[PDB]
Design a protein around this motif. Structure first.
Motif, mmCIF file in Angstrom:
data_model
loop_
_atom_site.group_PDB
_atom_site.id
_atom_site.type_symbol
_atom_site.label_atom_id
_atom_site.label_comp_id
_atom_site.label_asym_id
_atom_site.label_seq_id
_atom_site.Cartn_x
_atom_site.Cartn_y
_atom_site.Cartn_z
ATOM 1 N N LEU A 133 70.597 18.022 63.045
ATOM 2 C CA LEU A 133 70.566 19.280 62.310
ATOM 3 C C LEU A 133 71.947 19.923 62.333
ATOM 4 C CD1 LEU A 133 68.553 21.152 60.749
ATOM 5 C CD2 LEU A 133 68.181 22.369 62.894
ATOM 6 N N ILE A 134 72.984 19.103 62.184
ATOM 7 C CA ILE A 134 74.358 19.589 62.147
ATOM 8 C C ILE A 134 74.641 20.105 60.744
ATOM 9 C CG2 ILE A 134 76.777 19.029 62.549
ATOM 10 C CD1 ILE A 134 74.262 16.613 63.898
ATOM 11 N N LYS A 135 74.453 21.408 60.540
ATOM 12 C CA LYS A 135 74.530 22.023 59.217
ATOM 13 C C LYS A 135 75.510 23.188 59.238
ATOM 14 C CE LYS A 135 70.449 21.931 57.813
ATOM 15 N NZ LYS A 135 69.049 22.192 57.375
ATOM 16 N N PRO A 136 76.796 22.926 59.014
ATOM 17 C CA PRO A 136 77.748 24.029 58.837
ATOM 18 C C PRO A 136 77.404 24.847 57.602
ATOM 19 C CG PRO A 136 78.754 21.920 58.275
ATOM 20 C CD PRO A 136 77.452 21.609 58.944
ATOM 21 N N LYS A 137 77.676 26.149 57.682
ATOM 22 C CA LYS A 137 77.352 27.083 56.612
ATOM 23 C C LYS A 137 78.519 27.303 55.657
ATOM 24 C CE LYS A 137 74.627 30.529 57.511
ATOM 25 N NZ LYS A 137 73.311 29.985 57.081
ATOM 26 N N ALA A 138 79.400 26.310 55.510
ATOM 27 C CA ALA A 138 80.594 26.494 54.692
ATOM 28 C C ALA A 138 80.243 26.660 53.217
ATOM 29 C CB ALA A 138 81.551 25.319 54.893
ATOM 30 N N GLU A 139 79.436 25.753 52.670
ATOM 31 C CA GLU A 139 79.031 25.816 51.269
ATOM 32 C C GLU A 139 77.519 25.669 51.179
ATOM 33 O OE1 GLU A 139 81.135 23.430 52.377
ATOM 34 O OE2 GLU A 139 80.213 21.468 52.043
ATOM 35 N N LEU A 140 76.870 26.620 50.508
ATOM 36 C CA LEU A 140 75.426 26.581 50.312
ATOM 37 C C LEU A 140 75.035 27.645 49.293
ATOM 38 C CD1 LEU A 140 72.978 24.994 51.453
ATOM 39 C CD2 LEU A 140 72.668 26.851 53.083
ATOM 40 N N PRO A 141 74.138 27.337 48.353
ATOM 41 C CA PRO A 141 73.767 28.332 47.338
ATOM 42 C C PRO A 141 73.141 29.572 47.962
ATOM 43 C CG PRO A 141 73.083 26.138 46.665
ATOM 44 C CD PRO A 141 73.524 26.026 48.093
ATOM 45 N N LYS A 142 73.491 30.729 47.408
ATOM 46 C CA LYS A 142 72.999 32.008 47.901
ATOM 47 C C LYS A 142 71.730 32.411 47.162
ATOM 48 C CE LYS A 142 77.097 32.087 49.918
ATOM 49 N NZ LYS A 142 77.999 30.903 49.915
ATOM 50 N N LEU A 143 70.887 33.179 47.847
ATOM 51 C CA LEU A 143 69.571 33.528 47.330
ATOM 52 C C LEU A 143 68.941 34.577 48.233
ATOM 53 C CD1 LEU A 143 66.982 30.747 48.283
ATOM 54 C CD2 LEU A 143 69.237 30.985 49.321
ATOM 55 N N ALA A 144 68.002 35.332 47.669
ATOM 56 C CA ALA A 144 67.216 36.314 48.406
ATOM 57 C C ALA A 144 65.753 35.897 48.363
ATOM 58 C CB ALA A 144 67.390 37.717 47.823
ATOM 59 N N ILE A 145 65.083 35.961 49.513
ATOM 60 C CA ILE A 145 63.732 35.438 49.663
ATOM 61 C C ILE A 145 62.809 36.545 50.148
ATOM 62 C CG2 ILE A 145 62.293 33.642 50.686
ATOM 63 C CD1 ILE A 145 65.982 33.225 51.062
ATOM 64 N N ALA A 146 61.649 36.657 49.511
ATOM 65 C CA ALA A 146 60.551 37.498 49.964
ATOM 66 C C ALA A 146 59.302 36.636 50.126
ATOM 67 C CB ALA A 146 60.305 38.654 48.990
ATOM 68 N N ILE A 147 58.345 37.132 50.907
ATOM 69 C CA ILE A 147 57.128 36.388 51.210
ATOM 70 C C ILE A 147 55.926 37.288 50.967
ATOM 71 C CG2 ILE A 147 55.773 35.276 53.022
ATOM 72 C CD1 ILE A 147 58.383 34.350 54.275
ATOM 73 N N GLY A 148 54.919 36.746 50.284
ATOM 74 C CA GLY A 148 53.683 37.464 50.054
ATOM 75 C C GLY A 148 52.503 36.811 50.743
ATOM 76 N N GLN A 149 51.364 37.498 50.758
ATOM 77 C CA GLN A 149 50.161 36.967 51.395
ATOM 78 C C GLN A 149 48.960 37.654 50.766
ATOM 79 O OE1 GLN A 149 47.786 38.062 53.911
ATOM 80 N NE2 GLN A 149 47.129 36.058 54.677
ATOM 81 N N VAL A 150 48.062 36.872 50.175
ATOM 82 C CA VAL A 150 46.979 37.412 49.366
ATOM 83 C C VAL A 150 45.680 37.537 50.156
ATOM 84 C CG1 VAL A 150 46.392 35.132 48.443
ATOM 85 C CG2 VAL A 150 45.753 37.195 47.174
#
Length: 212
Positions: free
Chosen positions: A55-72
């Motif tokens: 799980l060697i995952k540098p954060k140098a390049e990665l697409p940006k996004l905003a996340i929300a979670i719902g529950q019904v």
DNA sequence: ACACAAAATATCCAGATTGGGGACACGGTGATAAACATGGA
């Protein structure tokens, strides 16, 4: 911008460092959500390495996004106690030290648990290129996901939001993780999250921006 | 082989009686095993 719904009959989200006895949370963690979104995008993980840790995952390049979670609808849980793949924690010896071909030889069953049903309305704010890539992946050339279809505008439900030290929560999740690599680091600070039951769109505080 | 006519009024059960006596199980037992994790020099 636009968001989507999903459902599945069975699910399991094991918190890390559970130990012998395994557990689960009523809502999947943020990291698992991001992994699912990346998998559906058709883009492979940045890391192609094999060894003790993968799980060697540098954060140098990665697409940006905003996340929300719902529950019904609230979902119960059940437990099954069959077998587990033990990792030796004692000097041990004998047969394990004889063959040694990906051994994992010692076996001892304890417990684990799973969910009964899952149905979520996930919210995403992402650039247009990522959404187009998701559309191409879904339409183009472990009992976790059953079917997916975007019904964003209708089918309202509850949402989640971090809580500050005031009042009291209700039906809140125990722990949640934003970003993590399985090596020595600081993990994540914000842990407590609580749901709010209201029909209209989630507040601005509900949306969380992932560093990745 | 022709025509005409084809029933009418009273009455259709009355009493007495519908079970009694005894008994509703006795003993013996109610799983047995294997599947470790941390310390000080």
């Amino acid at each position: 911008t636009r968001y989507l719904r999903l459902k599945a009959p069975f699910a399991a989200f094991r918190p890390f460092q559970s130990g012998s006895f395994r557990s689960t949370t009523p809502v999947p963690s943020f990291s698992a959500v991001y992994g699912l979104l990346l998998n559906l995008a058709g883009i492979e993980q940045r890391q192609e390495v094999e060894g003790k840790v993968t799980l060697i995952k540098p954060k140098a390049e990665l697409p940006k996004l905003a996340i929300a979670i719902g529950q019904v609808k609230p979902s119960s849980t059940s437990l099954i106690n069959q077998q587990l793949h033990n990792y030796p924690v004692g000097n041990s010896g004998k047969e394990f030290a004889s063959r040694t071909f990906g051994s994992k030889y010692w076996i001892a069953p304890v417990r684990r648990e799973v969910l009964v049903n899952l149905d979520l309305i996930i919210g995403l704010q992402s650039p247009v290129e990522f959404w187009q890539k998701l559309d191409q992946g879904l339409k183009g050339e472990n009992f976790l996901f059953d079917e997916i279809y975007p019904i964003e505008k209708p089918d309202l439900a509850s949402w989640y939001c971090p809580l500050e030290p005031d009042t009291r929560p209700n039906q809140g999740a125990c722990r949640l993780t934003l970003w993590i690599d399985r090596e020595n680091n600081t993990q994540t600070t914000i842990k407590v999250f609580s749901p709010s039951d209201f029909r209209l769109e989630p507040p601005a505080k509900a949306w969380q921006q992932l560093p990745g």
